[PDB]
Amino acid sequence: GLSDGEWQQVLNVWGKVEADIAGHGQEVLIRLFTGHPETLEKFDKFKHLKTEAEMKASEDLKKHGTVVLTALGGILKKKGHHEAELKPLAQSHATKHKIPIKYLEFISDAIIHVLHSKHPGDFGADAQGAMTKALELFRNDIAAKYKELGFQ
Numbered sequence: 001g002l003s004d005g006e007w008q009q010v011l012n013v014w015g016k017v018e019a020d021i022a023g024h025g026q027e028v029l030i031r032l033f034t035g036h037p038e039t040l041e042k043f044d045k046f047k048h049l050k051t052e053a054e055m056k057a058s059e060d061l062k063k064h065g066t067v068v069l070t071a072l073g074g075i076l077k078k079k080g081h082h083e084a085e086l087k088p089l090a091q092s093h094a095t096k097h098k099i100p101i102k103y104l105e106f107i108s109d110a111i112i113h114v115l116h117s118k119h120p121g122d123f124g125a126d127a128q129g130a131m132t133k134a135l136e137l138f139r140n141d142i143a144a145k146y147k148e149l150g151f152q
C-alpha cells in the first residue's frame with residue numbers, strides 16, 4: 001500500500017526509465033544474469049551467453065529487456081489496481097517459466113542497483129523508498145497467486 005505521494009515518486013522515477021527503456025532493460029537483465037547465474041538457466045534463448053560481452057552485444061537480450069520493462073511499467077501505472085495485468089504474468093511465470101519468487105526478489109534489487117548506476121546522485125532516498133515499496137507490492141501480489149497454485 002502506497003500513498004499518493006509515494007506513487008508520484010514512483011512514476012517520476014519511471015520517467016527516467018522510459019527515456020531509454022532498452023538501455024535500462026538491458027542493464028537490468030545483465031545485472032540479474034551476472035549477479036545470479038542460475039537465473040540465466042531459465043532462459044533457453046539466453047543460456048548460450050557465456051560472457052558479459054556477449055550479453056551486451058545481444059540484440060535479443062535488449063529486446064527482452066524492453067518486453068519486461070514495458071510490462072512492469074504498465075503495472076506500475078495502475079498504482080496498485082493491477083489485478084488484470086498481474087494475473088497472466090503470475091500464471092505464466094508459475095506454470096510455464098517456473099520462476100521462483102526468489103528470482104523476482106533478485107530482479108527487484110537489480111532494478112534499484114541499475115537506477116543508482118545510471119543516475120548517480122539523482123535517485124534520492126525518498127525515490128528509492130517508494131520504488132522499493134512498489135516492487136514489494138508487485139512481488140507480494142505475485143506471491144499470493146503462487147500460493148494459490150501451490151508453486152514453489
Ligand code: HEM
Nearest residue numbers: 039042043045067068071072088089092097099103104107
Ligand atoms: C519485473 C519482473 C518481470 C516482468 C514484468 C516480466 C515480464 C515478462 C513478460 C511480459 C514475458 C513475456 C510474456 C510471458 O511469457 O508471460 C516474460 C517472459 C519470460 N520471463 Fe519474465 N518478467 C519478469 C521477471 C522474470 C524473472 C525474474 C525471470 C527469470 C529469472 C523471468 C523469466 C522469463 C522467461 C523464461 C520468459 C520467457 C522468455 C522467452 O523464451 O521468450 N521473468 N516475462
